[PDB]
Amino acid sequence: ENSLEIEELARFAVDEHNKKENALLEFVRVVKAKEQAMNTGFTLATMYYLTLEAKDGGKKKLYEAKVWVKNTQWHNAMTNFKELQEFKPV
Amino acid sequence: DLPKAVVFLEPQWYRVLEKDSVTLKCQGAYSPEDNSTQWFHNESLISSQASSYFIDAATVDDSGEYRCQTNLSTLSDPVQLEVHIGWLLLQAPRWVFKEEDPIHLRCHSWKNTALHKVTYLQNGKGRKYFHHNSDFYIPKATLKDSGSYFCRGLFGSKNVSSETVNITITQG
Numbered sequence: 001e002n003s004l005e006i007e008e009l010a011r012f013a014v015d016e017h018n019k020k021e022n023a024l025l026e027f028v029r030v031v032k033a034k035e036q037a038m039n040t041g042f043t044l045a046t047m048y049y050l051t052l053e054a055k056d057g058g059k060k061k062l063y064e065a066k067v068w069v070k071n072t073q074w075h076n077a078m079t080n081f082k083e084l085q086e087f088k089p090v
Numbered sequence: 091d092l093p094k095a096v097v098f099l100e101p102q103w104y105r106v107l108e109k110d111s112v113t114l115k116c117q118g119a120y121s122p123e124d125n126s127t128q129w130f131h132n133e134s135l136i137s138s139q140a141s142s143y144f145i146d147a148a149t150v151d152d153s154g155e156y157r158c159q160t161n162l163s164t165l166s167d168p169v170q171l172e173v174h175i176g177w178l179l180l181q182a183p184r185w186v187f188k189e190e191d192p193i194h195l196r197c198h199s200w201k202n203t204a205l206h207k208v209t210y211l212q213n214g215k216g217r218k219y220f221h222h223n224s225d226f227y228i229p230k231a232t233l234k235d236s237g238s239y240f241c242r243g244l245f246g247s248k249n250v251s252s253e254t255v256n257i258t259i260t261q262g
């Protein structure tokens with residue numbers, strides 16, 4: 001919840017949200033984090049459900065973010081893929 | 091939870107050498123009203139509609155991800171197929187395992203190239219040795235089995251090591 005890996009995903013969620021919706025949210029902190037591993041024989045993947053606090057025009061607001069992280073292998077080369085799938089307020 | 095179809099490989103190796111034979115089979119229910127199968131290669135629908143998809147002699151183009159579907163079974167998860175070209179290849183059915191799963195590895199040589207004094211290595215340390223080329227088995231997988239794997243043997247007097255591949259064991 002308060003680890004570096006969580007924060008990077010939360011900042012990534014905010015950076016991606018601003019990019020697609022052309023917004024200007026400033027990440028502050030993560031307040032809750034739930035993980036759901038979804039591996040297969042050919043991927044180490046996890047779906048992250050994050051609740052974070054960001055400043056919307058100076059005012060702090062809470063948002064729920066859904067981030068998908070996928071690790072696959074080709075021969076012996078690993079590829080990490082991250083994706084923001086949902087970003088909504090509370 | 092959806093009733094997902096499943097693609098499985100016969101033989102089970104997802105890493106194969108060029109010219110090997112591979113048959114992809116769709117595990118799914120088939121109704122008499124509609125007994126066809128939808129196959130996908132690299133996310134694109136292909137023409138074959140049979141329950142099995144045959145690859146007589148594999149080429150690098152046959153590599154990629156495969157998915158299948160039937161009337162009664164929903165789109166399967168992808169199965170990965172890697173066609174390699176080289177003297178030696180360490181084979182496996184997948185690279186992600188769960189605790190207690192069996193791990194069956196095979197040191198495969200190019201066509202018509204006998205190989206002996208074979209060793210399976212994990213993170214650089216040997217795990218099992220065979221004078222005659224045999225398969226490596228781990229009936230009960232454990233978190234300590236995770237690591238980089240490769241096999242090396244002798245083509246007569248030539249000592250050869252296969253390309254490495256990373257295996258991961260997850261909680262059960």
Ligand SMILES: *[C@@H]1O[C@H](CO)[C@@H](O)[C@H](O)[C@H]1NC(C)=O
Binds near residue numbers: 124
């Ligand atoms: C199964 O086949 C019937 C036609 O025989 C078709 O109407 C139906 O939509 C099919 N079901 C699915 C899930 O595609």
Ligand SMILES: *[C@@H]1O[C@H](CO)[C@@H](O)[C@H](O)[C@H]1NC(C)=O
Binds near residue numbers: 125
């Ligand atoms: C699938 O259905 C068609 C038409 O009903 C039939 O000709 C064919 O034999 C069937 N295939 C199998 C494998 O049952």
Ligand SMILES: *[C@@H]1O[C@H](CO)[C@@H](O)[C@H](O)[C@H]1NC(C)=O
Binds near residue numbers: 151153
């Ligand atoms: C499918 O994707 C793999 C991944 O790179 C590629 O090697 C292969 O050639 C592709 N096959 C086709 C038919 O596009």
Ligand SMILES: *[C@@H]1O[C@H](CO)[C@@H](O)[C@H](O)[C@H]1NC(C)=O
Binds near residue numbers: 208249
């Ligand atoms: C092959 O070479 C490796 C080092 O490259 C060595 O450890 C091994 O003893 C040699 N012979 C066999 C049969 O592996």
Ligand SMILES: *[C@@H]1O[C@H](CO)[C@@H](O)[C@H](O)[C@H]1NC(C)=O
Binds near residue numbers: 237
């Ligand atoms: C494979 O796993 C080992 C674990 O010992 C790690 O050191 C190595 O970086 C991994 N290779 C790749 C390509 O991820």
